[PDB]
């Protein structure tokens, strides 16, 4: 096997879309998750006849086994394509997943929208108020610009070409209203249950010539969903950007001292760098870096690392502070920041003065909606009005935020993981924000004391 690049994919779709069987099939045949449980049920399946079994039957038994709490593997799921190691999320319906999608680890490089082909199930899935549209809108807002559509349950409509064409037409309208360009989107007719066009091409649709998508360099074509995933375009990783490392935890370890832990979001951390912690503005040398079982010569974007620093107490740095390179655009606290806010469906309206909690990277801080500066056309960004008096569900707006506690944030264009946030209220995420500008920034330690 050859060396693979890493990509993240999120799979979205209505409860009747079959997206869990579809995702499960890819992980089963192209990955290695819960394989002892898989093997138990492959052997058990001999009982159904004389030995043959359907992958979907095994997936059903694996699901029941997971529900019992007795499978071993964690919920971090991966599979292979020829080019890639794919980390995949079968998006939960859980309402607390929304914050996790915005501030959790790793934005998706590509969304896969699974569409049920049956007449009643298709219509149910494209409701403007449905969870599926909200997930698609969140992905689009967060900069997931690549999309694949799989039209599932094609067996149930007898692999009819006209039905597929009408679904493609209506789904193209659905995703265009969100903001995707349908010409860049492969549409793949599949059967997640029977395997058609998943890893091997279907024999049930002689009319089917394959999917295509426009790209910057030409037109890419294929037959299967696995081919469409392999054709995802290689995103650029922020290795050469300045270091940003939001803290998750801070430990005091006997014989070692202070050990902050967090994910490298941009740049690289190395022993011997001099780093600064914002918003406090404490500066110190990195003594060593560790991750899991290994000591590192460098932690790179995506690594969750511990690192040891001297002359910093566990009391002067905390979760939500941001570590960066003192020698290369060091991080700073802010007096305010202006962000584009997309208001999600929720039982309320927003006026200036609203002060909910914002989750941004590892920070969890109430911020005032100090001014509503603009309302905008969401897809184009065009200003529709100055100083709207309130925001309602669906609005896109430029808002000036004032944090209630010292807070380090960034413009999304510069440091994307520190420039997106979730707004929490009424036991849900009520809005998603993308930071567009930041107003960034002596007292002696003796004087402070």
């Amino acid at each position: 096997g050859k060396e693979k690049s890493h990509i993240n994919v999120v799979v979205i779709g209505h409860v009747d879309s079959g997206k869990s069987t579809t995702t499960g099939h890819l992980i089963y045949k192209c990955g290695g998750i819960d394989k002892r449980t898989i093997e138990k049920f492959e052997k058990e399946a001999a009982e159904l006849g004389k030995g043959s079994f359907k992958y979907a039957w095994v997936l059903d038994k694996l699901k029941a086994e997971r529900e019992r709490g007795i499978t071993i593997d964690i919920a971090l799921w991966k599979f292979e394509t020829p080019k890639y190691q794919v980390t995949v999320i079968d998006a939960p319906g859980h309402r607390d997943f929304i914050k996790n999608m915005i501030t959790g680890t790793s934005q998706a490089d590509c969304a896969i929208l699974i569409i049920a082909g049956g007449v009643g199930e298709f219509e149910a899935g494209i409701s403007k108020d449905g969870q599926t549209r909200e997930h698609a809108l969140l992905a689009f807002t967060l900069g997931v610009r690549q999309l694949i559509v799989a039209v599932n349950k094609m067996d149930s409509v007898k692999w009819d070409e006209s039905r597929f064409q009408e679904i493609v037409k209506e789904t193209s309208n659905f995703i265009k209203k969100v903001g995707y360009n349908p010409k860049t989107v492969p549409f793949v007719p599949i059967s997640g249950w029977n395997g058609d066009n998943m890893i091997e091409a279907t024999t049930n649709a002689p009319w089917y010539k394959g999917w295509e998508k426009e790209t910057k360099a030409g037109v890419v074509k294929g037959k299967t969903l696995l081919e469409a995933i392999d054709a995802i375009e290689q995103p650029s990783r922020p290795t050469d950007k300045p270091l940003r490392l939001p803290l998750q935890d801070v430990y005091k370890i006997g014989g070692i001292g202070t050990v902050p832990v967090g994910r490298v979001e941009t740049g690289v951390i190395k022993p011997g760098m001099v780093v600064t912690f914002a918003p406090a503005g404490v500066t110190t040398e990195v003594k060593s870096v560790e991750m899991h079982h290994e000591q590192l010569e460098q932690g790179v974007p995506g690594d969750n690392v511990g690192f040891n620093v001297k002359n910093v107490s566990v009391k002067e740095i905390r979760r939500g502070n941001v570590c960066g390179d003192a020698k290369n655009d060091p991080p700073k606290g802010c007096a305010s920041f202006n962000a584009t806010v997309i208001v999600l469906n929720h039982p309320g309206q927003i006026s200036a003065g609203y002060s909910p909690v914002l989750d941004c990277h590892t920070a969890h801080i109430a911020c005032r909606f100090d001014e509503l500066l603009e309302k905008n056309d969401r897809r184009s960004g065009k200003k529709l009005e100055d100083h709207p008096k309130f925001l309602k569900s669906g609005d896109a707006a430029l808002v000036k935020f004032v944090p209630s506690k010292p807070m380090c944030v960034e413009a999304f264009s510069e440091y994307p993981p520190l420039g997106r946030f979730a707004v929490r209220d009424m036991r849900q995420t009520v809005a998603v924000g993308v930071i567009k500008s930041v107003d960034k920034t002596x007292x002696x330690x003796x004087x402070x004391x």
Partner: protein, 93 residues
């Protein structure tokens, strides 16, 4: 009912205060949390560096019955053992 409730499988990271925290007590206290629609699953203690280990524990939740925000806050009430919790991963079932 003839139709089942929507579920998610969640892996929680539960972090101790230091390398000396009693991890068996920490996971015992997590697993003692009872909520309708919450099923605890498998767990492991995973090194994170410098001799610290985190608890990584699976659970399965009924989406409409179990708030993950509330579950995290409840776990974090064990301040003698728990510094923080985070969602390592989560999936639809």
């Amino acid at each position: 009912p003839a139709k089942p409730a929507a579920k998610s499988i969640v892996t929680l990271d539960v972090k101790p205060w230091d390398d000396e925290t009693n991890l068996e007590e920490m996971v015992a206290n997590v697993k003692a949390i009872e909520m309708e629609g919450l099923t605890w699953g498998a767990h492991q203690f995973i090194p994170i560096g410098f001799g610290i280990k985190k608890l990584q524990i699976n659970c399965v939740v009924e989406d409409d019955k179990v708030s993950l925000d509330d579950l995290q806050q409840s776990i974090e009430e064990d301040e003698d053992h728990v510094q923080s919790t985070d969602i390592a991963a989560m999936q639809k079932l």
